[PDB]
Design a protein around this ligand. Structure first.
Ligand SMILES: *Cc1c(COP(=O)(O)O)cnc(C)c1O
Ligand SMILES: *Cc1c(COP(=O)(O)O)cnc(C)c1O
Lengths: 361, 361
């Protein structure tokens, strides 16, 4: 107890041990006589954690070469504008894969900057079925192909990504980054707000292939050019010091879990338990996406009626559950089971779901 | 001991009691079963601290009306571009008061957006003498007048601000905000990176007069429009949750210190002690600014030679002092004595300075 069953979608759950280690040295970090947040960002102590965070990330990815890890403020949302601002040139078109609410918000910002094109869309099936890699139509003058790896709101997640050739593949991985191993070489730029699966909100991780950002558009404000972060190791202005420190702590933890392949099989156990609960409910619980498009990060499901779903939420909160209330725009229920969400919280959810069913039947 | 004499210029010193209170509830906040950083930004618990922070700030300012407190990411640097992007229209000119390095960086971004004009400059005296309010020449087509209240690097600070009439006065208060009371009604927009005098880095506080940002330029990306923050209470996308929580803790503390008028007389004691040390040194220590332009936040001084200054830094570090190394571009030494820097750290600095002088004479 005193540790709620947290299924929040973002901000979300952080490992208990990383919170404790952070609490232990919160006031006095490594007997330096000060907190990590009272130290200069150009000092030897912070720069060490700053650079180690970047090194641990790539190592977890299998040590790809030719990529830079940048730490930028503004959330994944600011990246919605920064991406077309840096890569969308005149004569070209920003190609987007439409799979849900976040893909839709990414495209909206792009139009403010230049010409856009919908490469594939799953809107015809209400975003219940992800577009197949074959259905993705790329243009000859495409600046890049942007996709949302995991649709946090609708509960859909790509199992594989397409080969875009010379055209840079860009992916919003806010809700599933570092939850499963993938080939970074397929991407030109990968981004993620840290608050979903890496811990603290206030920092956005951007892994960019060096040759794409060597030279940024001169007309852009200094803070919106990628080369400002590259040439300055994300230290041009004061960085989100504490957040980066916490990101490094979560990375150490992922390694303790057996790296990406370890957290993957663990997250795969948590997901199959909850989906099993849904599939063996004889219709009481209904999945919001086609089985093949199912996400292991965000599980969306519904009940027979709107009132029944209202009863579910209330009952779950009275029993310690937090965040099951499905997103306003979609409705229903959503169990967000990121890396740090324990298998026990899922076990508890499956029992609650079984009891609730029987008390309503 | 185990608490170094921290004179860092930013990130900087935070009150020991605020660090301890924050450490106490770091893992379990108010017996909710989770940390403040694992909770939803739309939930009742975070929204309460989020809004209370805004209420405490205005209250400390004497409760001015018609102003909104916004929490934006990107640091004071992003505001360098966001300001002309939102207020510099065609036909108008962005007027700047040039007083040092930060005023100079603010102006540089502005030119990328539109027409600019130097309203007054202290460059002729090497930024040692602030321009007098009378010397400030405003244009008829001025969009606003921007000034840097405290020049963190050179050590100059305005004692009073000008009456700009219909023209909005905008001020960068990163290094002196909430260190002394002022009439907010004189300004249209005031901004400050929090890491200098309000605590944690990762959040920028913007206090804007409501009538100036009711409607932002439609062409701008969503995250760079002020009305996105106003209409959404800075909750359009995930905010710097933990940082805002820490900002609220520092505000409670400032109140315990007797509000703005209390921290002012305290900061005034710390400054006169150090300046006294400089003025009664018979030339060994030399102030970098004219007495009337002296800052109570950042004290810049020099020694007879470059080698002597190198010896000062080394000796001070071996004795527990952090951050006295003057900024690279200016050289010399800088004692940053923000709100949270104890009178004792200043007492210790004055003794060190006296001993060092005698060991070199
Ligand atoms: C959380 C999320 C975002 C928005 O992140 P913010 O930091 O709130 O801007 C964007 N895209 C996806 C896929 C997300 O999950
Ligand atoms: C610290 C400071 C800045 C820059 O703040 P960042 O958060 O590093 O962008 C700008 N102006 C002044 C006056 C400052 O003191």
């Amino acid at each position: 107890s005193e540790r709620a069953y947290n299924f929040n979608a973002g901000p979300a759950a952080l490992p208990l041990e990383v919170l404790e280690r952070a609490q232990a040295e919160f006031v006095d970090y490594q007997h330096t006589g000060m907190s990590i947040m009272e130290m200069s960002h150009r000092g030897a102590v912070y720069e060490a954690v700053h650079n180690e965070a970047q090194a641990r990330l790539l190592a977890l990815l299998g040590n790809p070469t030719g990529y830079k890890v940048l730490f930028i403020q503004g959330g994944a949302s600011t990246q919605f504008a920064m991406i077309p601002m840096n890569f969308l040139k005149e004569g070209q078109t920003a190609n987007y894969v439409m799979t849900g609410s976040w893909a839709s918000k990414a495209l909206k910002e792009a139009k403010l900057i230049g010409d856009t094109h919908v490469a594939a869309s799953s809107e015809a099936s209400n975003y219940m079925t992800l577009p197949k890699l074959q259905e993705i139509q790329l243009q000859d003058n495409a600046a890049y192909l942007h996709l949302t790896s995991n649709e946090t709101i609708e509960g859909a997640q790509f199992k594989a990504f397409p080969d875009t050739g010379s055209v840079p593949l860009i992916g919003d991985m806010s809700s599933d980054i570092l939850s499963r191993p993938f080939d970074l070489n397929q991407f030109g730029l990968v981004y993620a707000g840290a608050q979903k699966n890496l811990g603290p909100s206030g920092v956005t991780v951007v892994i960019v292939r060096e040759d794409l950002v060597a030279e940024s558009p001169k007309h852009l404000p200094t803070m919106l050019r990628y080369d400002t972060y590259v040439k300055n190791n994300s230290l041009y202005n004061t960085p989100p010091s504490f957040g980066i420190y916490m990101v490094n702590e979560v990375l150490k933890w992922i390694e303790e879990r057996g790296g990406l392949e370890g957290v993957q099989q663990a997250n795969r156990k948590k997901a199959s338990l909850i989906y099993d609960a849904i599939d063996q409910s004889g219709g009481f619980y209904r999945g919001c996406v086609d089985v093949d498009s199912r996400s292991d990060m965000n599980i969306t499901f519904r009940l027979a009626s709107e009132e029944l779903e209202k009863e579910f939420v209330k009952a779950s909160e009275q029993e310690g559950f937090v965040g099951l209330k499905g997103h306003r725009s979609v409705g229903g229920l959503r169990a967000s089971i990121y890396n740090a969400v324990p298998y026990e919280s899922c076990e508890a959810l499956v029992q609650f779901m079984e009891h609730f069913k029987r008390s309503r039947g």
